[PDB]
Every structure is written in C-alpha cells, then in structure tokens.
Design an enzyme around this catalytic site. Structure first.
Site, PDB file in Angstrom:
ATOM      1  N   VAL C   7       3.530  -0.353  -9.323  1.00 30.31           N
ATOM      2  CA  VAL C   7       3.575   0.670  -8.288  1.00 30.31           C
ATOM      3  C   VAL C   7       2.732   0.230  -7.101  1.00 30.31           C
ATOM      4  O   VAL C   7       1.936  -0.707  -7.184  1.00 30.31           O
ATOM      5  CB  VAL C   7       3.079   2.042  -8.792  1.00 30.31           C
ATOM      6  CG1 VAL C   7       3.797   2.437 -10.066  1.00 30.31           C
ATOM      7  CG2 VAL C   7       1.584   2.010  -9.013  1.00 30.31           C
ATOM      8  N   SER C   8       2.924   0.927  -5.984  1.00 29.74           N
ATOM      9  CA  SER C   8       2.122   0.730  -4.782  1.00 29.74           C
ATOM     10  C   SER C   8       1.992   2.072  -4.085  1.00 29.74           C
ATOM     11  O   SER C   8       2.972   2.581  -3.535  1.00 29.74           O
ATOM     12  CB  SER C   8       2.754  -0.302  -3.850  1.00 29.74           C
ATOM     13  OG  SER C   8       1.986  -0.451  -2.672  1.00 29.74           O
ATOM     14  N   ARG C   9       0.788   2.641  -4.107  1.00 28.90           N
ATOM     15  CA  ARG C   9       0.600   3.999  -3.614  1.00 28.90           C
ATOM     16  C   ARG C   9       0.789   4.110  -2.109  1.00 28.90           C
ATOM     17  O   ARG C   9       1.118   5.192  -1.613  1.00 28.90           O
ATOM     18  CB  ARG C   9      -0.782   4.508  -4.012  1.00 28.90           C
ATOM     19  CG  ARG C   9      -1.022   4.455  -5.503  1.00 28.90           C
ATOM     20  CD  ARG C   9      -2.493   4.534  -5.826  1.00 28.90           C
ATOM     21  NE  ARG C   9      -2.920   5.907  -6.067  1.00 28.90           N
ATOM     22  CZ  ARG C   9      -3.588   6.295  -7.146  1.00 28.90           C
ATOM     23  NH1 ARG C   9      -3.900   5.412  -8.086  1.00 28.90           N
ATOM     24  NH2 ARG C   9      -3.941   7.565  -7.290  1.00 28.90           N
ATOM     25  N   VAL C  10       0.579   3.024  -1.364  1.00 23.73           N
ATOM     26  CA  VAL C  10       0.881   3.049   0.064  1.00 23.73           C
ATOM     27  C   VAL C  10       2.376   3.231   0.277  1.00 23.73           C
ATOM     28  O   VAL C  10       2.812   4.037   1.106  1.00 23.73           O
ATOM     29  CB  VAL C  10       0.358   1.775   0.747  1.00 23.73           C
ATOM     30  CG1 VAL C  10       0.785   1.753   2.194  1.00 23.73           C
ATOM     31  CG2 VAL C  10      -1.148   1.716   0.648  1.00 23.73           C
ATOM     32  N   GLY C  11       3.182   2.489  -0.477  1.00 26.83           N
ATOM     33  CA  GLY C  11       4.611   2.743  -0.495  1.00 26.83           C
ATOM     34  C   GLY C  11       5.308   2.294   0.775  1.00 26.83           C
ATOM     35  O   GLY C  11       5.025   1.228   1.331  1.00 26.83           O
TER      36      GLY C  11
END
Lengths: 144, 116, 73, 138, 116, 73, 116
Positions: C7-11
């Site tokens: 995952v990557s919370r910045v997105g």
C-alpha cells in the site's frame, strides 16, 4: 506464530472432510439408481434382437448394408464422456484407450472421424484435432 | 548468476529450470488431496519434467564411491547446459524418469534408457 | 512485488496525471485475478467470464516483469 | 379370451397385463387384434392404442411410432416413446417429466461445484505457509 | 443494535440486510464457477438485492467539493429506514443497480433512474 | 449454546421429574441433527429416513432460540 | 502382552481377537454406504463373530448387585481363553448374539442360549 490461523485451517479441513463424506453418500445412491435403470432397457433390446434374427433368417434372399462386412477405408467413433470432472481417471483412461486405437488404425492408412458426447470429450478432441461430425453437451443422468 | 557474467544462454536455462521446479512445488499440494488426473495436460507435463530434472541433478562423486560403489563422474559445464536445454525442450519426454538417476552427462541417460 | 499487501497512503496524489489516469485498469485487473487465484489450475472447469478474467490477469501479471538496471521513463 | 399384452418403450415398460382386444393403426391401416391371431408385424403410425379388458374397462396408451408384434397368445408393442395417458396433447404431461428431470440435472451441477470443487481447493490453498515455520524457535 | 433502544423496525431491517449480505457472500464461489444461470430462482433475487444494497451504501462527502459537487446529504434516519424496507420488500426491484450509486435518499435514486 | 461440548456432571439428579423425563427427545434430536448436518446443503437425493431426521433436527434447533429478559417457567 | 510373558496361546488368541475387531471396524463403513449384501460371505462371518465378541466383553459387577439383582461374576483365566478360542474357530456360530450379553464364562452362555 499466529496459532489461531492454524487452528482455523484445521477446522476448515475437518469441515471439508465432512463435506466429502456426504457426497460419497449421495454418489452411492445414484449409482444404485442408474444400476437399476440399466435393467429396464433390457426387454426392448431382447425383443428387437429376437424379431430381427427371425426376420433375417426366414428371408435370406438379401443382405442389408448393416449386416455385411465391406472393405474399410474410414472408421468412426462415438465417444461418450461425463460433463464434469472429479470422477477418478474415467475420462483419461477412456481417451488413452481411444487414442491408442486410433494410432493403431493410422498405420493401416485409414483415417478416423468422431462424434462426441459429453463436455470432456468435446474439449479433449477439439484440442486433439481430428474430423468431428457432431457434438452434444449437457446429457444429464437420465437422457431422453 | 547474471547475464553479463555467465552469458545469456546459461542464465536463461537456469531461470527456466528454477521456474519449472517452482511450479511443480506449487502443484504438489493439489495432487495430494485430489488426484493427478484433475490437472490439465500442461501441468502433468510439467510434473513429469520436474521429476526428471530433480533426478538429473544427482551425481556420483569421486569420493562417495566408498558408500555406494559406483565410480565418480566429472561433468563439464557444456554437457550440463546441453542436457538441460534438451530436457526443457521436451526432446526426452520418452525417457523413463529412472534413467536420469545417478548418471553423468546426457549420453549416459540415453545409454541407461536403452539398457532398460 | 506483492500487490495484495503493498500500500501507499499518499496514493494518487503522488502520481503524474497520465499514470494516475491509467493505473486504474492495472489495479482492477490484478484485483480480479487475485480474488479467484485459488482456481487458477482449474480453468477447464469454469464459465466464460471468469476464464476471460484469468486470461487477462495472467497477461497483466506477465506485463509487470522488468529487468535490472534499466528503468522506464 | 385373454392374451398377454406388453407395451415397452426403449427406457422402461409402460403397460402390461392380460387383455381381450387391441386396436392400432398400422402402415396399411387400422387393425383389429383378437386372441389366436396369425403372426404379424407392422410399423405404427403416431396414434393412441386402445385395449379392452374383460370387465369392459378400456385403457388407452399413447404411442409415437414403433413396431407392433402379435403372436397367438402374446402381443408385444415396441414404442419409441410411450405414455400411459389418453389424449393427443400428452406433450402437456411429458413436459412435467422433462421439467422435473431437467431441474434435477441442474441442481446436481449446482451441488458438484459448490460442494466438491470449492472446498477441495480451499483446503489445499495455504498449506505451505504452515510447513515452513515448522522448526522455528523464534 | 438492540430492539429496545432503536425500536423494532430498525432492528428487523438491519437483521434482514445482514442476512442477505452474508448469504450473497457465501454464493460467491458458486457464482464464479457455474455462473448466474444455474442458480435457483431463489438466490438470484438475493444476488440482485445484495448488489443493490452494496451500491446503496455509497455516499457523497460534503467536504470533498471536488469530483463530487459539494453534495452534502446528511440523510435523516427515517429516510434510510423507509428506503431499505422498500428495497428488501421489492418495490424497487425493477430499477437498474447503477441508479443506487452515489446518491442520498430514495427520492434521488428514483430521480436518477427516471432520468436515465 | 454449543450443545456438542457443553456438559453438566451433576446430570439428571438436578432436574424436576417432568423435564427429566422429557429431555431425552431433545438430546437425541440434537445429536442426530449434529451428526449429519452436512446433508442440509444438498437436500436433493436425501433418502426418506435421513430427510425425516433433518426435518426434526432443524425444527428442534429453531425451537431453542429465545429472546432476552423473557424466561420460561 | 508378549509371548515370552503370558505364554504362547494367550498371545495368539488376543491378537486374533484384535484382528477380527479391526476388520469389523473396516467393514462397518462399507455396510453403511454400500448395503449389507455387497459383502462376501467371509465378511458376513467376520461381522457376526465380531458382534458376538463385542457382546462377550460385557459382564455384571459385584457392586452393581445392590443396584441390579444380577450377582457379579468373576471369570478367571483359562476360561475366557477357552471361550474366545471356541468363538474364533466358528464352534459357536449357531448361537444368537443376545446369548453373549452380560454373562460370565462360556458355560453360562450355552445355558442362556438353551433358555432362548
């Protein structure tokens, strides 16, 4: 090491073990049903054989084209199979037998044509190539 | 083990062998609960090739002849690469897997298959 | 790279416009191919929709392979 | 008197018993059958068969094509598809058997996938994750 | 979620929705293997209503104001109760599932479905 | 209540005469239903005997449900 | 339970009894699935004698004498061995099962069979 995951996996496997036991229970009953259904088709064939034999013996003037052996150039195969797997090596052994027989017929320089019954045979001999003439699918348990 | 050191061909052969072994390792679980006949034809072919590959890595050492008795073998790299290329190409699909066990180069495999 | 649990919370805010617009198809193709990966070896016994889903998922998975020391603009 | 009549299809036997008379439509035309008849065999038009019991009750059987065989003591009717009902509209009653058998064959494939192929892959899915941590002391 | 504190219709609607959703979640493997055609006449309504329910949980967020249109909805609870009671009962069973997506009360979904 | 593993070692001597007499049917019905609960999913080729057992077991199972604050004498 | 400790005959009698019980356990599932008539005659004898054995392992206790009027029986060795050696050789195949229930040595079994 997350032992609850292993406990859940063991529980699920034990549940599937119960699942398969019931499927065996049912398969035995249907085997009995089809086994006793095989018997009901006997008298029709017996009577027809008797009538045909008497008719052909009492009037020997002519020979029909289905009762005389003419030289062979092409042969044919009517292959019956199941519609879904999970039944031993039934289809695989049957297809190995027919493939070996076809290979034996190949050296005689006589080619083959097919007529397939059941999904497994349709797929197998569509991938095999060959000269298909017809196909049938979804026969069921008590075909009409 | 990178293309710039051992060459393109050797690297490709090694990666293909590892891929075949990995797929066989993944199939090993289904063929235990279900049967070998639930798989497609490609998967059965991969299983047979992977068993042959596993056998073909066996070798009689020069110092292990005390335990077994068979004389040791010393296989050059070119023979290994040539044998595994053929085994992956399917040329040896007609050799029983017992002929790949405790042998040297690929010629011994054919000789042992003929003896059988 | 394991796409299931990475995952990557910045997105999306950390992507250029074009890649941000295009990555949706890749993400959904991998999601669909991953939901039913348990039946991957049983493609012979399935309907047509899920078989097409497998056909596309395998191809997109094959697309993600890449060599070393050679980055893409 | 009475004579043994058997009406059997390709699947099972439909009708049986002792009857005094039979009416059928052969290739040439209608035929009346009584005991002691000379041996004979025809091909039946797709029409009903009428049999007269000794008591006077008369059963009717619908036959769509087949072979009639008669002997001095036994009448054997070989029918492609025979149903014991009366009228010409028996497709409206054959449809019941068709629908029932089709529903059973549908629910079967509904159970083959759901029970067998679903669970038996779930069990084999994630075993490897457990066997690798077998020896760990952490 | 207790009939004493939230009344009886609220609790019954919630229980019915949960039952529908957790039966549709179980039908997943069967739908994937066979398809939608071979299911019974019952459990097709369950699939359609569960898909509709999953869509109808969607919500536009007021603070976003971008890609949505500043759509503050803040639907009263009574509206949701009425809507889900109708949806479970089947008064809205004829509406395409794409209408139930990204709207508030049932008036909005009716308007969107009629517009299309 | 998981009736399979729950146990009371005091047993029968802790019940009134009527309930002590009547509990046997409940116990055997739960046992038989729990033995063959796998068949509940097929419900197609169930023979006459086991279908009756399933019908009784599901009905007894449905019977045991109860609300809160509403005890039964 | 070793031939060196309990003698020779006792060990073989016990092992044969255990073998018969094991075979009967293997046969009960076949009885459940495939009908009683599917078994061969040897399995018919195995089932009958295994049921007789399972009955014969029951006996009344002296402590139950207060609860139940049947006095307790203390059957020694050289009497159980005779009974089981006779039972395993078919010598008692004409006795019904019920005569092997809650009783001591073989003599009382014969008597109870006579009273049946």
């Amino acid at each position: 090491a997350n032992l609850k995951e292993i406990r859940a996996k063991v529980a699920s496997i034990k549940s599937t073990q119960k699942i398969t036991r019931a499927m065996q229970m049912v398969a035995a009953s249907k085997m009995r049903r089809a086994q006793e259904r095989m018997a009901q088709g006997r008298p029709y064939a017996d009577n027809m054989r008797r009538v045909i034999a008497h008719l052909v013996q009492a009037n020997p003037e002519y020979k029909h084209r289905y009762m005389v052996d003419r030289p062979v150039k092409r042969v044919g195969y009517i292959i019956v199979s199941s519609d879904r797997g999970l039944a031993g090596g039934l289809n695989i052994n049957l297809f190995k037998k027919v493939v070996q027989h076809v290979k034996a017929q190949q050296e005689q320089s006589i080619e083959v044509q097919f007529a397939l019954i059941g999904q497994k045979a349709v797929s197998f001999f569509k991938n095999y190539g060959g000269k298909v003439l017809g196909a049938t699918t979804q026969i069921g348990d008590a075909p009409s | 083990l990178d293309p710039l050191v051992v060459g393109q061909e050797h690297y490709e052969i090694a990666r293909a062998v590892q891929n075949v072994l990995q797929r066989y390792k993944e199939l090993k679980d289904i063929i235990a609960i279900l049967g070998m006949d639930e798989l497609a034809e490609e998967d059965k072919l991969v299983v047979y090739r992977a068993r042959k590959i596993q056998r073909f890595f066996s070798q009689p050492f020069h110092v292990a002849e005390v335990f077994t008795g068979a004389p040791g073998k010393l296989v050059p790299l070119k023979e290994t690469i040539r044998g595994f290329k053929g085994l992956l190409a399917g040329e040896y699909d007609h050799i029983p897997e017992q002929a790949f066990y405790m042998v040297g180069g690929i010629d011994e495999v054919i000789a042992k298959a003929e003896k059988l | 790279v394991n796409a299931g649990i990475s995952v990557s919370r910045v997105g999306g805010s950390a992507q250029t416009k074009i890649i941000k617009k295009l990555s949706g198809g890749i993400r959904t193709a991998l999601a669909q191919y991953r939901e039913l990966a348990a039946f991957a070896q049983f493609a012979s016994d399935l309907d047509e929709a899920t078989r097409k889903q497998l056909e596309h998922g395998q191809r997109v998975t094959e697309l993600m392979k890449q060599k070393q020391y050679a980055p893409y603009s | 008197a009475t004579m043994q009549c058997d009406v059997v299809s390709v699947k099972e036997s439909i009708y049986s018993g002792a009857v005094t008379m039979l009416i059928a439509k052969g290739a040439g035309g209608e035929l009346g059958i009584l005991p002691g008849h000379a041996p004979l065999v025809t091909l039946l038009q797709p029409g009903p068969i009428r049999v007269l019991l000794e008591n006077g009750t008369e059963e009717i059987v619908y036959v769509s094509g087949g072979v009639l065989e008669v002997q001095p003591h036994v009448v054997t009717v070989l029918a492609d598809t025979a149903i014991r009902a009366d009228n010409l509209d028996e497709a409206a009653i054959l449809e019941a058997r068709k629908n029932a058998e089709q529903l059973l064959a549908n629910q079967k494939s509904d159970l083959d996938s759901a029970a067998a192929l679903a669970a038996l892959a779930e069990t084999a899915a994630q075993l490897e994750t457990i066997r690798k941590i077998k020896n760990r002391a952490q």
